[PDB]
C-alpha cells in the first residue's frame with residue numbers, strides 16, 4: 001500500500017519547502033526534526049549506529065527484532081553510517097581507502113567501518129533510512145585536505161549504493177541517502193553534489209557542517225550548497241541544530257534536521273523557549289511561577305513551574321533535567337510544526353522574521 | 365523460611381563490624397554500599413534504593429503499586445530500601461509549607477499538590493513495595509544554630525514515633541518489611557544523644573545517622589561520627605545517609621557504619637571522573653588520550669576488561685554518551701569492590717592495615 005520512499009512537496013516559499021516523505025512505516029512531515037531514539041510528537045527517530053555497534057552489538061539488536069522492537073517504535077527509523085565517528089574518534093582509527101578500523105579493545109574485540117560493513121550494520125539495525133558511509137571532514141580543513149576527504153567519501157558513497165542495492169530486502173523496503181562533503185569550499189561542494197547525483201540516492205544530506213564553523217559561515221555554505229542537490233529530493237542537514245539555525249536552514253532549503261541539543265541543553269540547565277533559551281539555574285527563576293514557556297503545549301509545561309524546576313536542579317534531583325529535556329524535545333517538534341504551518345500559509349518569511357525578533361529579544 | 369530482618373555481626377575490629385542483614389528477599393553483606401536503582405558478581409550489590417520523592421512524582425506511588433511494586437518496576441527480586449522524603453523536606457524547603465503535621469509542597473500548574481508526613485511517607489514506601497523503610501525525618505540544614513538544630517531534631521523525633529506507629533498499623537508491611545530510625549542533631553553532641561535515646565525508646569530495626577554529608581567536610585563529619593555512632597544500639601545496623609567518597613566510606617567504617625548510599629558514582633561518571641585505587645582520575649586529562657590501560661589496573665568490572673582509558677577519554681571528548689556510561693558502570697562496580705575488600709579485611713582482622721594502605725595509595729595519586 002504505502003510506497004517505499006515518496007517525497008512530495010506541498011508548498012514552497014523562496015527556498016523553503018514543506019511536504020511529506022511517505023515510507024512503508026509511516027509519513028514524515030517536512031521540514032522535520034528527528035530526535036535521538038532510545039530503548040523503550042515526532043514522525044521518525046534516530047539510532048546512533050556506532051553506539052549500537054558497541055552496545056549491545058548490531059547482531060544482538062538484529063536477533064531481538066531490530067531497532068523497531070528495540071525502541072518500541074513502529075514508525076520510520078533513520079541511522080547514521082559512522083562517518084562522523086570516523087572523524088570525531090579519528091585518533092583511535094586506522095583509515096584507508098578500504099575503510100576505517102578502530103583500536104583493538106582490551107578483550108581482543110575489534111570494530112571496523114567501511115561502506116559495505118556500515119550498510120550491513122544499518123540493515124541489521126532494521127533502519128528505514130540508511131546513510132552512506134562517508135567522512136565528516138574536520139573543521140577547519142585545507143582545500144587540499146577537504147578535497148581528498150570529499151573525494152574519498154564520494155568513492156565510499158558509490159560503494160554504499162552498491163552495498164545497499166546488493167541486499168534485496170533492504171533495497172525494497174529501506175531508503176538510501178547520499179552525504180555531500182567538501183567543507184566550506186564551493187567548487188568541492190559542487191563536485192560532491194554532482195558525484196552524488198550521478199550515483200543516485202533517495203535523499204541528499206549536507207554533511208560536514210555544524211563542526212565549529214559558526215552560523216554565519218554555515219549559512220554561507222548552505223547558500224550555494226543546497227541548490228546543488230536535486231530539488232525534488234529531501235535535503236537533510238546533519239547535526240543542526242539550534243532553533244535559529246533550523247529556521248535559517250529551512251530558509252535555505254533544508255527538509256530534515258537532527259542534533260543532540262534538546263537533551264544536552266536539558267541536562268545542562270538550558271531550556272528552549274520562544275523568547276530564547278533560558279538558564280533555569282539563574283536566580284531570576286527561583287520564584288518564577290510561570291512554566292518554562294507560556295505557549296508550550298508539552299506535558300512538562302502543563303504541570304511544572306520554572307521555580308520548581310530551578311529548585312529540583314539546585315537540589316540535585318535528576319527529575320529536573322528530565323523535565324527540561326522533555327520540554328526541549330517537545331518544543332523542537334512545536335517549532336517544526338509552526339515552520340510547516342507557516343510555509344503552507346505562504347507566511348514563512350514573516351514567521352522567520354517574527355521568530356527571530358522574539359527569540360533574540362530574550363523577553364522570557 | 366528467611367527471617368523478616370536479622371542483623372548478625374561476624375567479625376569486629378575496633379569500632380568496625382562486618383556481618384549480614386538477613387531479610388525475606390535476600391542477604392545484605394555489611395558494610396554495604398547500596399546503589400540507586402533504576403527502571404529495568406564481584407561487582408554486584410545486595411540491595412538497591414528508590415528515590416521515593418522522585419517516584420512519588422513520576423510516575424506516582426499508586427502506579428508503581430499497580431505494576432507490581434518497585435521489585436517488578438526495577439526488575440529486582442532482592443531487598444530494596446526507600447528514603448522517606450526527609451532530605452527533600454530540606455533540599456526543596458523553599459517549595460514547602462512545613463508544620464507539625466507534615467510538609468506540603470507548592471501546588472503545580474495543573475492543580476496537583478503533593479504532601480509528605482510520617483503517615484503518608486510510610487504509606488508511599490509501602491505502595492512502593494519497599495523492604496527497608498526510613499522514618500519520615502528532616503535532614504537539618506547545615507550550618508544550623510544550636511536552637512534551630514534542636515527544634516528540627518525534636519520535631520523529627522516526634523515524626524519518628526508517628527512513622528513507627530504508621531508502619532506498625534499495616535500488617536503486611538509490619539510482618540515483611542523493616543523500619544529504620546534516623547538520628548538528627550546536626551553537629552551537636554548533646555542533641556545527637558537526645559535523638560539516639562529518643563529513637564531507641566521507640567524501637568527500630570536499624571538506625572541511620574542523618575543530617576551529615578551536607579557540606580560540613582570530612583573532618584567535621586568524622587568528628588560527629590566519633591560520638592554519634594556509639595549512641596546507637598550496637599546490635600543494630602548503622603546507616604550513614606549520603607556518604608560518600610571512598611575515603612569517607614573507609615573512615616566511616618572505622619567508626620561503626622554498616623550501610624552507605626550516595627550518587628557520586630553516577631555523578632562522577634557523568635562528569636568525567638573515575639574512581640581508582642590510586643584516587644579519582646579525570647579521564648578528560650590529555651594524559652589519558654593514549655593511555656592503553658583500563659580505568660583501574662585491578663578492577664574486575666566489565667568495562668575494565670574491555671575499555672581503555674584512551675578509548676573512554678576520546679568517547680567523552682567526542683560527545684559519545686557511551687563514555688559517561690562506561691565511567692559510571694566502572695564507578696558503581698568499583699564501589700562494590702571497595703566494600704568487599706572492606707568486608708574481607710575486617711573478617712581477617714586486618715581492616716586497620718587496609719585503611720592505612722588504602723589511604724596511602726588513594727592519596728598518593730600514582731594513577
Ligand SMILES: CNc1nc2c(CC[C@H]3O[C@H](OC)[C@H](OC)[C@@H](OC)[C@@H]3OC)c3nc(N)[nH]c(=O)c3cc2[nH]1
Pocket residue numbers: 036037046047048049079080081082083084085131134135136137179206207208209210211238239240258259260
Ligand atoms: C553535531 N554536528 C554534526 N553531526 C554530524 C553527523 C553525525 C550525526 C549523528 O550525531 C550523533 O552521533 C554522532 C547522534 O547520536 C547521538 C546521531 O543520532 C542518532 C546523529 O546521526 C543522525 C554527521 N554524520 C555523518 N555521517 N556525516 C556528516 O558529515 C555529519 C556531520 C555532522 N555534523
Ligand SMILES: CNc1nc2c(CC[C@H]3O[C@H](OC)[C@H](OC)[C@@H](OC)[C@@H]3OC)c3nc(N)[nH]c(=O)c3cc2[nH]1
Pocket residue numbers: 400401413414415416446447448449450451452498501502503504546573574575576577578605606607625626627
Ligand atoms: C548527600 N547527602 C545526604 N543525603 C541524605 C539523605 C537522602 C539520601 C537519598 O539521596 C538521594 O535522594 C535525595 C537519593 O536519590 C537519588 C536517594 O537514593 C534513592 C537517597 O535515599 C537513600 C537523607 N535522607 C533522609 N531522609 N534524612 C537525612 O538526614 C539524610 C541525610 C543525607 N545526606
Ligand SMILES: [Zn+2]
Pocket residue numbers: 292293296297298299300301302327328330331
Ligand atoms: Zn514545555
Ligand SMILES: [Zn+2]
Pocket residue numbers: 659660663664665666667668694695697698
Ligand atoms: Zn572497572
